[PDB]
Enzyme design. Structure first.
Site, PDB file in Angstrom:
ATOM      1  CB  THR A  19      30.908   2.060  21.659  1.00 38.52           C
ATOM      2  OG1 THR A  19      32.130   1.758  20.976  1.00 38.52           O
ATOM      3  CG2 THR A  19      30.805   3.561  21.858  1.00 38.52           C
ATOM      4  CB  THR A  20      29.081   3.168  26.955  1.00 36.17           C
ATOM      5  OG1 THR A  20      29.006   1.741  27.030  1.00 36.17           O
ATOM      6  CG2 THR A  20      27.874   3.775  27.653  1.00 36.17           C
ATOM      7  CE  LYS A  27      34.886   3.799  21.717  1.00 35.39           C
ATOM      8  NZ  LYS A  27      34.174   2.803  22.550  1.00 35.39           N
ATOM      9  CB  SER A  79      26.984  -2.117  22.305  1.00 34.51           C
ATOM     10  OG  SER A  79      28.238  -1.931  22.935  1.00 34.51           O
ATOM     11  N   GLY A  80      26.618  -0.407  25.003  1.00 36.37           N
ATOM     12  CA  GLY A  80      26.519  -0.477  26.450  1.00 36.37           C
ATOM     13  C   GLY A  80      25.412   0.355  27.061  1.00 36.37           C
TER      14      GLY A  80
END
Lengths: 246, 204, 202, 222, 241, 244, 237, 232
Positions: free
Chosen positions: C1-2, C33, C130-131
């Protein structure tokens, strides 16, 4: 709040518990129930008060409740209180069976329920149960048994007894008509029919249950309209002959 | 492994207008036999039985608590319980212990109290019910019983044929399982009678 | 996810990728999101989907009740504080990095990070998931003060595109939302609308 | 287990296989995995069978109370909210993965609900051990606003992919078609597999089994 | 006649007499006045001194319930201190949950509901105090609320509680407080307190003054001693002439 | 009998010999203690609540003196009776609606909110240790299916939907006036509904209202959000009423 | 009457009769006086003997190094309150490693004793307290009442016939601030003597003293330890 | 506060629970209700007169479904009835969750009567001021029950409750017949209501529900309109 509290569980100046006495007064007006113990069985006979013509019949009986394989009871007094107590009786019996894997002896069931009633008379500030019960049962310790309990939590065993309307006259009749140790189920049913006739009969106005032993098993049976009609007719012709003889 | 501690096997099978329920008789602890007459099939009605396999203590506890609940139900309702309702009651009982489960996997076999229609079912230890039209099995030798039943069961069997089928299935299945056997008991439930038989079985 | 949010004079721009994975399986490739917590207050969620969904729903309820009681539009800082209280109180049970971005009349457009552990900090821009690790440098090199809303939208799109190219746990489409006094304008960049950077050859 | 669902032009199609296993042995050949929630809402369940059964029964009963009190048809969003909040309360220890589908006043709605309480609102979803094969079928063939028959065929092909490529899935294909004007619970919709014919006869004739003891208890009939 | 013994009993006319009796307790107390002006809020209290044995400042009836919120009370002082503790807890909890100063209207509503909860039951009795809450903020302006034993909360431009509330209200109504500053309003408050004070019945009294406004940067505090001395001089000069 | 009493039946919610609950009747009497009156009228695509506004003291901050409350963005209410009881009930209704949305994912219908509040009230009528609240709540909102909705709940726990209703001192006369109006016809436009509500209040009070003497709240199918009118809009309505 | 049995019943006059009756409980007790100078706080308690063979009831108690109290009223309630105060001071020293300021202790007492005055079935505490303390703000005399109100006093007297002591204290309070410890105690003793009847007189048996100050932890003087303070006392009028 | 722990219903010297009799007086002052058990179903009817035309008569219903196969109606106090309806629906759902079978009518009636009894003995509460008529269909059989404020319940073929219920019972005795079908039962129920009705009856003045094999359902105003036109 102190102002509104009824003070149900207190003594009176003469050492009496007024709520218990009033509950017994309530039972005095309920439908008549009588229990008779015989050598080969025990019977309950109850006066039906729900006698309206538009009532429907859907249940096993109106006032007689099976408590377990070997025990049944009749109730005089407040109906809904009686439902509460019969549910508690069934629960007590099943708990005993779960713990010991034998049926609860009759007196133990009666004592367990009377403890609940007595508790309601001693603490908690609640009104007592307005119910008297007749119990009939069989166990291996004492055989065929008939007990009676009242709202105070007192109980006793009887060879024959009556609660509810006109219980005093029925008790007098039983005192003068019961043959200790010499009663059969047949003569017991005859005596029950006579006593209910005096303290009041017709078949639709009475329900009768018998408890007997057959092949080491307990049989609890509510007499059908045919059997009760036959018993009433037998009593009627017996009385006719007795009258004619005089 | 916990349910292999005592061993055991039960099986139920459906005939034309009849059901059969069978169980092995061994009560042992791991490899040691203790008795050869341990009850695993319990009556729940005139024509309704439950067989329990798995841990012996849980077998006994579940049978007793189920009898508690069934007795109260039949007093309150004034009628015999139907097989499906008993299955739901057992499922509820087992699921109540969802995270502390009883280690037993019941099978139920009976006839409808009013229609006398065959009913069988099985439940996992947390109470998932499975109703089948041919046969159910439970216990340590489930694979063996599955083989035997899949091969021998036929639709619309009369009581004698149902007896032979379930008997052969049980005997041959338990003969290949070390911790099940020491005798087999079979109950054939019909409209008019219950026939109970114990089979000639290997005792090793 | 970013996930990303950037403040500009008069509002905020939020952006996210749309990939939700279980292990290496993409369970949802068009996830949303960016969650509206209130009329002009959004949150971008990263971490466990169940945790962020539950926390965002709880905060939405609390903030709506609070706004009704006070009869006034909620402050972005208030929503960030509610998120912070929940994320700190249950930091041992939650796995949730949140970005709360919005507009209110008192402090304009605001961005707050509530990372795992439940601290809360206001920032000119925030990234997470995470990104985000793969674009720190890029953002630090590209961000400048006084960017207009259009420039902030382009900046967020570029940053998310780069993160998505590198991060196996990110991808799909880019969801953007601009929040200002006038309201919330949402859009989705997909396919060729996503900024492209050539892979070096030879 | 393979369960799937899609949104088509006028409603929802849900689908499931009918196999239930214990370990690597088939326990039930005809397991019903599509669960009634309300007349307009159904739920396919994968994961722990007891958990799925109990969770869907509980939410169905709660939704029945809600509909009795409101006097209105329940909304799919309500079912999703109840399910997800319960599952989150249990922190994933209720192993229920669900495909919830319905038609309410706001149209057709399809959710996937995961054991930990996360949900996704999507036009098509797959779950179970055979979910990947069914999802491959959907990604290859799904189109928006399909007609009912196209959607039925698509969901059936997805469940068939699961049946034939996942050892945990098998037996029949059950479908449930939900629209504002009808509900078709098609059980079974297709029977792709069947037991082969028994070549030999292994009939145990009477007297084949030896018996030690016998007891016949006559039963009294009404 | 039996209907006035519990707050959980309506009289046949639909009144709750225990609440009215608590209000009487409030009415038998020395007066306090709050005045809202353009720049903030000023509180004055006529603290009756029941003996010279008491230290100056004993039994204060002005409280700080939050940095930005002051509270003036009339009635049973112990009940008032209990309500001040409740108000402080409400403000602190609001800051803990939402991360900013509790708006005065919201605080007044919360405390009023706490007061109301004590008007419904035989288990407890209504509070025997009325009180005013004053606050000033840049975003909200100046706010003045009053709460009574029944739990009714209202915003005011000028409020008087206590035994001389009606005369104090008549005096307050003569001021155009909407276009005045706190500096003049403190003098006017001192003058009104001195006017309504009963010199014969009440013997001696101390003037308690507090305020919250732009000149205090939104912080509620006692009026500085020189300011109070000037205000009291003005009030006495107004009385004598 | 008639008005007979036994034991403590006038002090707590226990049945009188006639089967009455005197404390509930006394709470109804307490509703009138405020001295005010509110009216609600349901139009074709709108619902309107009008209510008296009284500010005897010029020191009162008139903005803070109101009986109209937002319960949700789409649900508004007018409260009549004891003010603090009314505020507690409004707080409870707001909590119920927010909890409903949190638990079920859609906005609470007006009828369901009224039922919930009425159930809480009913509880007050069966447990002896607390009194009933001395207030009555009228809720308005737009249901997507039924259209505009006016509902009323009272201290007895009894609630109902209405075409038009009133609460307070002039409840009976208001209901008579509105009964005549609805008998003659009921399909009102927004302006017609507002004017009917205002005329009911004016006739029962016999006053001709300045804008500042009344409060108006409205929901319409076009703008379902609950809106409280400004003195400008109220004066426009009052002038449009006087001219006719 | 119907208004004078519970603390939760307001009378039609706006009074709570049970609280006033607890006030009477305090007014029955034996007199005690508290006073202070710029540096010291003094409690002087007249102790009663129920019988000529019984010891006089202790009227001054320790709370903390910097705080002592004198009680008047029900002694069991006094012990309850003293234990609560001691625990509060212990909590302050445990958490903050500093003595609890006297005013904060008094506020805590106020909250504790106000709670029961509003709850059904509870009663007010039937004791009044004089609290002598020393902290960073100097010496302090506080008076707490069954009504849960408390007062910060230059000097105070509570108990039976304490009006005479209050009269003396009002007369002489101008001199207390610039008094040394001995003169302060003598003023306290004269005030207390004003409460005595003509027949009775202050002795070393019925007088107890308590002193706290900047360099003096709260000390209680009883029996012969009181003789130094009584020695310089003149003869009463 | 916490609730009072002592019972507000106690025995009188004559042995009567007078609060129960007073709750029954409240019931007898309620709007008339009628139940008739036909061969193939049950009909519940009740007068539904509004105080004024301003009341949206179709916003609150007196005939409520408890389950697909169980409905009920009442005489007495409406809010108490709402409480009991909510409890009954909860009890039915709990039974269904345990047994996976619709609760039998008799079992539902017993559980609801148990709740009503509890309110005659628990501390700090009064009894419910309502009597319920519960109709159900199970085991291919119709059931009609009445449950009173005391918690006592009775099985009826036909009965009347509320104002003027003694005359209603006499009328039902005269008219009732075990063999009559459901439509004849509906006609008889509406006629019973007509006996004690003030003014003209419309489809909006009365509420009717019917239980049969299909289930329990409230009749629509159009169906009631047809039945009323037939009755005339």
């Amino acid at each position: 709040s102190r102002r509104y509290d009824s003070r149900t569980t207190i003594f009176s100046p003469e050492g009496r518990l007024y709520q218990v006495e009033y509950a017994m007064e309530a039972i005095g007006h309920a439908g008549t129930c009588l229990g008779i113990l015989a050598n080969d069985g025990v019977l309950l006979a109850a006066e039906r008060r729900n006698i309206h013509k538009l009532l429907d019949e859907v249940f096993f009986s109106e006032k007689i409740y099976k408590l377990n394989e070997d025990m049944a009871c009749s109730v005089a007094g407040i109906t809904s209180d009686a439902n509460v107590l019969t549910n508690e009786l069934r629960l007590i019996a099943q708990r005993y069976l779960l713990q010991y894997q034998e049926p609860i002896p009759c007196e133990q069931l009666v004592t367990a329920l009377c403890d609940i009633k007595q508790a309601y008379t001693q603490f908690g500030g609640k009104r007592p149960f307005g119910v008297s019960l007749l119990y009939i049962g069989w166990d291996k310790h004492y055989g065929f048994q008939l007990y009676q309990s009242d709202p105070s939590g007192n109980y006793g065993g009887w060879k024959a007894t009556c609660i509810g309307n006109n219980s005093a006259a029925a008790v007098s009749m039983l005192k003068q008509d019961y043959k200790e140790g010499e009663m059969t189920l047949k003569s017991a049913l005859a005596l029950a029919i006579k006593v209910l006739n005096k303290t009041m009969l017709s078949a639709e106005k009475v329900e009768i249950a018998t408890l007997t032993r057959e092949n080491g098993k307990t049989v609890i049976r509510v007499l059908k309209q045919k059997e009760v009609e036959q018993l009433i007719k037998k009593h009627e012709e017996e009385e006719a002959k007795a009258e004619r003889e005089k | 492994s916990i349910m292999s501690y005592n061993g055991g096997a039960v099986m139920a099978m459906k005939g034309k207008n009849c059901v059969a329920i069978a169980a092995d008789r061994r009560f042992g602890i791991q490899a040691q036999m203790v008795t050869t007459d341990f009850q695993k099939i319990f009556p729940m009605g005139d024509r309704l039985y439950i067989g329990l396999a798995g841990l012996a203590t849980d077998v006994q506890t579940v049978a007793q608590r189920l009898k508690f609940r069934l007795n109260l139900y039949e007093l309150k309702e004034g009628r015999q319980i139907k097989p499906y309702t008993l299955m739901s009651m057992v499922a509820n009982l087992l699921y109540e212990k969802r995270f502390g489960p009883y280690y037993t996997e019941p099978v139920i076999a009976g006839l409808d109290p009013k229609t006398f229609k065959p009913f069988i079912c099985s439940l996992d230890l947390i109470g998932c019910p499975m109703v089948t039209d041919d046969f159910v099995v439970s216990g340590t030798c489930a694979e063996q019983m599955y083989g035997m039943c899949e091969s021998l069961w036929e639709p619309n069997m009369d009581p004698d044929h149902l007896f032979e089928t379930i008997s052969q299935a049980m005997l041959n299945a338990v003969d290949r399982d070390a911790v099940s056997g020491m005798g087999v008991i079979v109950h054939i439930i019909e409209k008019d009678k219950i026939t109970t038989r114990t089979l000639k079985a290997r005792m090793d | 996810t970013t996930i990303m949010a950037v403040q500009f004079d008069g509002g905020v721009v939020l952006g996210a990728d749309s990939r939700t994975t279980t292990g290496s399986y993409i369970a949802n490739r068009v996830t949303d999101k960016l969650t509206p917590i209130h009329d002009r207050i959004f949150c971008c969620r990263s971490g466990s989907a169940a945790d962020t969904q539950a926390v965002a729903d709880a905060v939405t309820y609390q903030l709506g009740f609070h706004s009704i009681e006070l009869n006034e539009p909620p402050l972005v800082h208030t929503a960030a504080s509610l998120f912070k209280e929940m994320c700190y109180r249950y930091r041992e049970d939650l796995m949730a990095g949140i970005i709360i971005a919005g507009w209110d009349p008192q402090e304009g457009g605001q961005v707050y990070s509530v990372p795992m552990g439940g601290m809360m900090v206001r920032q000119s821009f925030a990234i997470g998931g995470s990104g985000s690790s793969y674009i720190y440098g890029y953002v630090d090199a590209t961000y400048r003060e006084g960017m207009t809303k259009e420039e902030c939208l382009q900046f967020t799109a570029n940053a998310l595109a780069l993160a998505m190219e590198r991060d196996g746990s990110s991808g799909g489409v880019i969801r953007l939302a601009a929040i200002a006094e006038s309201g919330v304008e949402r859009q989705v960049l997909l396919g060729d609308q996503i900024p492209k950077f050539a892979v070096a050859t030879l | 287990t393979t369960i799937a669902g899609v949104v088509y032009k006028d409603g929802i199609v849900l689908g499931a296989d009918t196999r239930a296993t214990e370990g690597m042995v088939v326990a039930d050949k005809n397991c019903s995995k599509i669960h009634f929630i309300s007349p307009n809402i159904y739920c396919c369940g994968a994961g722990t069978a007891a958990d799925t059964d109990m969770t869907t029964q509980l939410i169905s009963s709660n939704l029945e109370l809600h509909s009795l009190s409101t006097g209105r048809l329940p909304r799919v969003v309500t079912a999703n909210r109840m399910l997800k909040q319960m599952l989150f309360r249990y922190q994933g220890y209720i192993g229920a993965a669900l495909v919830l589908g319905g038609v309410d006043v706001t149209g057709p709605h399809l959710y996937s609900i995961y054991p930990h309480g996360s949900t996704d609102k999507l036009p098509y979803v797959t779950m179970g051990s055979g979910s990947l094969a069914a999802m491959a079928v959907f990604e290859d063939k799904f189109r928006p606003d399909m007609e009912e028959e196209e959607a039925k065929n698509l969901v059936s092909e997805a469940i068939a992919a699961g049946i034939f490529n996942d050892l945990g899935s098998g037996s029949n294909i059950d479908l449930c078609v939900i629209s504002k004007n009808k509900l078709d619970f098609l059980r079974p919709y297709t029977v792709p597999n069947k037991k082969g014919t028994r070549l030999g006869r292994y009939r145990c004739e009477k007297g084949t089994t030896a018996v030690l003891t016998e007891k016949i208890t006559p039963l009294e009939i009404e | 006649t039996g209907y006035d013994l519990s707050a959980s009993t309506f009289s046949p006319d639909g009144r709750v007499f225990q609440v009215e009796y608590a209000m009487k307790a409030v009415e038998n107390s020395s007066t306090a006045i709050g005045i809202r002006c353009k720049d903030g809020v000023v509180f004055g209290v006529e603290k009756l001194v029941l003996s010279k044995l008491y230290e100056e400042g004993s039994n204060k009836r002005l409280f700080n319930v939050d940095r930005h919120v002051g509270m003036a009370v009339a009635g049973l002082l112990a009940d008032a201190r209990s309500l001040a503790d409740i108000a402080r807890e409400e403000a602190s909890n609001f800051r803990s949950n939402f991360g900013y100063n509790i708006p005065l209207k919201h605080l007044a509503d919360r405390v009023a509901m706490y007061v109301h909860a004590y008007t419904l039951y035989s288990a407890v009795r209504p509070f025997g105090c009325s009180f005013m809450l004053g606050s000033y903020s840049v975003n909200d302006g100046a706010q003045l609320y009053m709460i009574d034993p029944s739990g009714v909360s209202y915003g005011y431009w000028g409020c008087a509680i206590g035994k001389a509330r009606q005369a104090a209200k008549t005096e307050i109504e003569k001021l155009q407080m909407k276009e005045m500053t706190c500096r003049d309003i403190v003098k006017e408050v001192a003058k009104i307190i001195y006017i309504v004070h009963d010199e014969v019945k009440d013997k001696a009294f101390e003037l308690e003054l507090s305020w919250v406004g732009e000149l205090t940067n939104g912080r509620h505090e006692i009026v500085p001693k020189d300011i109070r001395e000037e205000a009291e001089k003005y009030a006495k000069e107004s009385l004598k002439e | 009998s008639r008005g007979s009493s036994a034991g403590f039946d006038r002090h707590i919610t226990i049945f009188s010999p006639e089967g009455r609950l005197y404390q509930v009747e006394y709470a109804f009497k307490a509703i009138n203690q405020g001295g005010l009156t509110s009216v609600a009228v349901r139009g074709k695509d709108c619902a309107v609540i009008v209510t008296q506004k009284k500010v005897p003291d010029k020191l009162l901050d008139s903005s803070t003196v109101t009986h109209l409350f937002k319960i949700t963005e789409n649900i508004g209410c007018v409260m009549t009776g004891m003010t603090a009881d009314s505020r507690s009930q409004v707080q409870r209704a707001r909590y119920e609606a927010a909890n409903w949305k949190y638990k079920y994912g859609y906005e609470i219908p007006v009828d369901m909110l009224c039922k919930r509040i009425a159930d809480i009230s009913q509880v007050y009528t069966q447990n002896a240790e607390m009194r009933p609240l001395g207030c009555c709540m009228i809720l308005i909102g737009i249901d997507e299916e039924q259209g505009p909705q006016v509902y009323k709940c009272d201290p007895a726990g009894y609630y109902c939907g209405f075409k038009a209703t009133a609460a307070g001192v002039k409840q009976t006369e208001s209901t008579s006036f509105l009964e005549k109006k609805v008998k003659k016809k009921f399909d009102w436009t927004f302006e017609q509904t507002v004017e009917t509500a205002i005329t009911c209040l004016s006739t029962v009070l016999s006053i001709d209202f300045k804008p500042s003497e009344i409060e108006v709240g409205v929901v319409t199918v076009e703008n379902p959000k609950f809106r409280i009118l400004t003195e400008a809009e109220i004066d426009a309505h009052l002038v449009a009423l006087a001219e006719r | 009457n119907q208004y004078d049995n519970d603390v939760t019943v307001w009378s039609p006059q706006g009074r709570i009769h049970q609280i006033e009756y607890a006030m009477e409980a305090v007014k029955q007790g034996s007199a005690t006086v508290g006073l202070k100078s710029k540096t010291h706080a003094v409690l002087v308690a007249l102790k009663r003997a129920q019988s000529e063979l019984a010891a006089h009831q202790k009227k001054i108690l320790h709370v903390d190094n910097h705080i002592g109290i004198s009680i008047a009223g029900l002694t069991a309630d006094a012990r309850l309150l003293c234990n609560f105060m001691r625990q509060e001071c212990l909590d302050s020293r445990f958490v903050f490693d500093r003595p609890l300021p006297v005013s904060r202790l008094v506020s805590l007492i106020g909250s504790k004793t106000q709670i029961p005055t509003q709850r059904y079935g509870r009663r007010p505490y039937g004791v009044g307290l004089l609290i002598a303390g020393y902290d960073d703000m100097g010496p302090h005399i506080f008076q707490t009442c069954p009504s849960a109100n408390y007062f910060d006093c230059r000097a105070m007297s509570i108990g039976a016939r304490s009006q005479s002591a209050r009269t003396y204290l009002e007369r002489h309070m101008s001199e207390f601030m610039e008094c040394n410890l001995n003169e302060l105690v003598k003023h306290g003793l004269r005030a207390l003597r004003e409460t005595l009847p003509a027949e009775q007189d202050l002795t070393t048996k019925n007088v107890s003293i308590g002193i706290v100050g900047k360099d003096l932890e709260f000390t209680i003087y009883d029996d012969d330890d009181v003789s130094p303070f009584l020695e310089g006392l003149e003869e009463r009028p | 506060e916490r609730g009072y722990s002592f019972s507000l219903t106690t025995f009188s010297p004559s042995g009567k629970l007078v609060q129960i009799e007073y709750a029954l007086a409240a019931v007898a002052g309620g709007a008339p209700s009628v139940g008739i058990k036909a061969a193939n179903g049950v009909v519940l009817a009740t007068e539904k007169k509004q105080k004024s035309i301003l009341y949206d008569e179709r916003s609150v219903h007196k005939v409520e479904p408890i389950t697909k196969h169980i409905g009920l109606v009442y005489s007495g106090m409406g809010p108490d009835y709402r409480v009991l309806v909510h409890r009954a629906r909860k009890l039915a759902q709990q039974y269904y969750l345990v047994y996976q079978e619709p609760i039998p009518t008799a079992q539902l009636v017993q559980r609801v009567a148990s709740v009503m009894q509890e309110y005659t003995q628990s501390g700090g509460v009064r009894p419910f001021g309502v009597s319920l008529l519960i109709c159900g269909w199970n085991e291919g059989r119709p059931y009609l029950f009445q449950s009173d404020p005391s918690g006592a319940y009775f099985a009826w073929k036909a009965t009347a409750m509320g104002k003027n219920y003694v005359n209603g019972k006499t009328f039902l005795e005269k008219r009732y017949n075990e063999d009559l079908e459901l439509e004849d039962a509906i006609h008889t129920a509406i006629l019973t209501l007509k006996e004690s009705f003030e003014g003209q009856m419309t489809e909006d003045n009365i509420e009717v529900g019917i239980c049969n094999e299909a289930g329990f359902r409230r009749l629509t105003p159009t169906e009631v309109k047809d039945y009323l036109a037939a009755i005339a």
